[PDB]
Amino acid sequence: SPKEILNLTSELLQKCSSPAPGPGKEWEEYVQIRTLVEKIRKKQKGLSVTFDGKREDYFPDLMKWASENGASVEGFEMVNFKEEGFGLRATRDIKAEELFLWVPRKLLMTVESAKNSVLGPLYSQDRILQAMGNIALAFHLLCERASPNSFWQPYIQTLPSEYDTPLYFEEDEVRYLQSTQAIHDVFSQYKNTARQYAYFYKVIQTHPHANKLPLKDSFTYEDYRWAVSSVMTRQNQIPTEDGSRVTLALIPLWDMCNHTNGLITTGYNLEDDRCECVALQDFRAGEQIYIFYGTRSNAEFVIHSGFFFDNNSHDRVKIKLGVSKSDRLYAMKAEVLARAGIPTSSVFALHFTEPPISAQLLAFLRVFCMTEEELKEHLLGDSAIDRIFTLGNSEFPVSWDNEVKLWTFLEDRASLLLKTYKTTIEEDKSVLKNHDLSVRAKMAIKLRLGEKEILEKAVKSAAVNREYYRQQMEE
């Protein structure tokens, strides 16, 4: 009964509205929330709207629908690949930099198109929809999915039925990620989504401006989990009709491309009011067409795109660093860092492809390890300005001594972080070799393996720099 569901959702909104659980209680907060959510989901009837046909049965409808509104529909076909899922395959040879794909705005689903929808009145009367475009986009999806004569029906009928975002993982699958950096953003994702479902279920059932929405008596946890994972795995940012501010939008036909390594080749053209994509490389006929999604970490690919990309040259882990206010040299270091446009304490990144540290982190480590004399040579004199300009440059060291002390610092810091994981690198390679795992399980384990392999790379890199610059002191 919907009276039992309204009781259960109030009980869920409460559990998700408390503060952070604490230090070593975040795994059990997530299991408690999981228990309540799974109870609700198993009393509901999955997706509220399902389609008679199979997914590929609606792609001609999508092509026909995109052709009539000006999109490119020639040169490619839809193929269900095992590895990436559905995607685009070239039916002809396509050269690098050729403009093969274009989608006018009239087809997109935007935040503003959600404001002009049957969702409109509720949107204008709800703080959270007004503040969160991605949620507003998500409810746009559900309201058009529930609309039998919707203009976007060819798009919605070709969207997946489920995803590999963590919102779909099992307990044992998320459990592999314990002690990682990644799992804290998986906890946030589950808590946030669960809170938003419990809040909006009450709104849809009782708000006077949601009364004649089609979602009224058909809004399951599954419905919302699918909507946000749809938005999360393929939403974009485009300019407005005029070009002043940016907005969030879903791009039909083009969002069907799968990711590979490379550069971004999809831009918006304000003049002709359309999204444009040039071929990132040469695609022979019969080869899959990929695009570069963006510079994103494996943590972000798994959590928000629902997959793990193996060849990811933009992989990174986070690292907290700052000058301790108990340093005798806090004031000078804080002024040098300020003059370099660098915060006193910040969250930096260790990287997978050399060099492990950006120009900003190297400049910080250099100031962090400077002596009083060196600090003065960057604060006073005619060369002080020119000396700060080169802090982030590997070819202009402050001293051999400074470099040795900062690579010694980095080597110890990554070594320390490595030990805070519950499994080792060798243990992870063993689990991948000797076990047989689901796709979602492989994601979790490859993710925690990746975090550690970056730390280990940083250790070795910092050690060889340490030894190179220590040989320079001896001469």
Binding site: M132, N134, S188, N192, Q196, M232, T233, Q235, N236, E300
Partner: peptide, 16 residues
């Protein structure tokens, strides 16, 4: 490069 790069699956904040 491009005037308006379109990043597919751009990361947004979901914390309401």
């Amino acid at each position: 490069t491009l005037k308006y790069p379109i990043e597919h699956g751009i990361i947004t904040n979901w914390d309401d």
